[PDB]
Design a protein around this ligand. Structure first.
Ligand code: H2H
Ligand code: ZN
Length: 299
């Protein structure tokens, strides 16, 4: 029986918001079965809880932001990427401020902190959302699709009109029943361009943004002295973002995601269109993990 997982132990990190550049304390706690993942603004009296679910996404400009009233939890995509990759159904995430800390710009630190604490299998079937039908969303040249597939698999393609890809369109594709999220995707850092410094300045964005937590690019140059973690880092990071944004469904996907330049917006649109077309999906468990179309790392 594929069982639900929580954290074995509590996890504490410190960091800054990429967008707010604020110091934030982060705590992840176990939660009981069918809790799902709930963010908690503990710097407010009363404490303000936003379940990590598609309906709660409010802004998707340069991050996925959870909103309940005038209250946001900004930039959830990387942590939720990590928590999906390791298969966590149930957790309380406590933040002392509006934004998850960026750490190094990838999910590496999160997967490491989580696996150090270890996971706890809980005595209840894990619910899975299976794609039964193709589901597609477009807006101009951006496109995002769910396709039935016995497994979980994430394709992504983007053309940047940017010198730094030395001409080439970035593409990649990963079967997570074949390949490790931890080795191949988790270490892929977020990234930004100096040609956007004005606009970002004019939106009060990327205030915590530096070489220390992001691949920074000035025309022909990635400024990061030590370069990249993979030749295809940028596109592997878009796959990390998609895994996080997708996990706001509140259950794991049996299916294939195909992204063509899709951002946080179009990812979230795809979730909504999907939830809405109940013909296109069903919830399933597996009484025998030995015949499931996906598996997970030992807890
Ligand atoms: C000195 O000049 C600088 C210019 C720019 C930046 C800078 C760094 C970042 N920026 C801006 C930004 O918007 N980020 C988030 C990127 C996205 C939205 C993402 O990963 N979301 O999860 S992405 C890859 O999907 O498009 C990282 C910087 F730090 C310095
Ligand atoms: Zn990202």
């Amino acid at each position: 029986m594929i069982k639900q997982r929580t954290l074995k132990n509590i996890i504490r990190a410190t960091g800054v918001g990429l967008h707010s550049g604020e110091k934030v304390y982060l705590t992840l706690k176990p939660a009981p079965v069918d809790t799902g993942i709930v963010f908690s603004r503990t710097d407010l009296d009363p404490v303000v809880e936003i379940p990590a679910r598609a309906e709660n996404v409010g802004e998707t400009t340069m991050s996925t932001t959870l909103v309940k009233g005038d209250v946001k939890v900004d930039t959830v995509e990387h942590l939720l990427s990590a928590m999906a990759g390791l298969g966590i159904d149930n957790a309380y995430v406590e933040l002392s401020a509006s934004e998850v800390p960026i750490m190094d710009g990838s999910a590496g630190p999160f997967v490491f902190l989580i696996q150090s604490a270890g996971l706890q299998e809980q005595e209840a079937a894990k619910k899975f959302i299976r794609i039964k039908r193709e589901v597609s969303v477009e807006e101009g040249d951006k496109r995002a699709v769910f396709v039935p597939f016995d497994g979980f698999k994430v394709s992504f393609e983007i053309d940047f009109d940017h010198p730094v890809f030395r001409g080439r369109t970035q593409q990649a594709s990963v079967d997570f029943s074949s390949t490790s999220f931890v080795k191949e995707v988790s270490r892929a850092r977020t990234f930004g361009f100096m040609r956007d410094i004005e606009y970002l300045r004019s939106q009060n964005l990327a205030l915590g943004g530096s070489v220390e937590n992001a691949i920074v690019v000035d025309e022909n140059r990635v400024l990061n002295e030590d370069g990249l973690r993979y030749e295809d880092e940028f596109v592997k990071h878009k796959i990390l973002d998609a895994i996080g944004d997708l996990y706001l469904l509140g259950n794991s996907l049996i299916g294939e995601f195909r992204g063509f330049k899709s951002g946080h917006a179009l990812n979230n649109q795809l979730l909504r269109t999907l939830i809405a077309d109940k013909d296109a999906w069903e919830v399933v468990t597996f009484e025998d993990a030995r015949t499931a179309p996906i598996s997970y790392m030992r807890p």
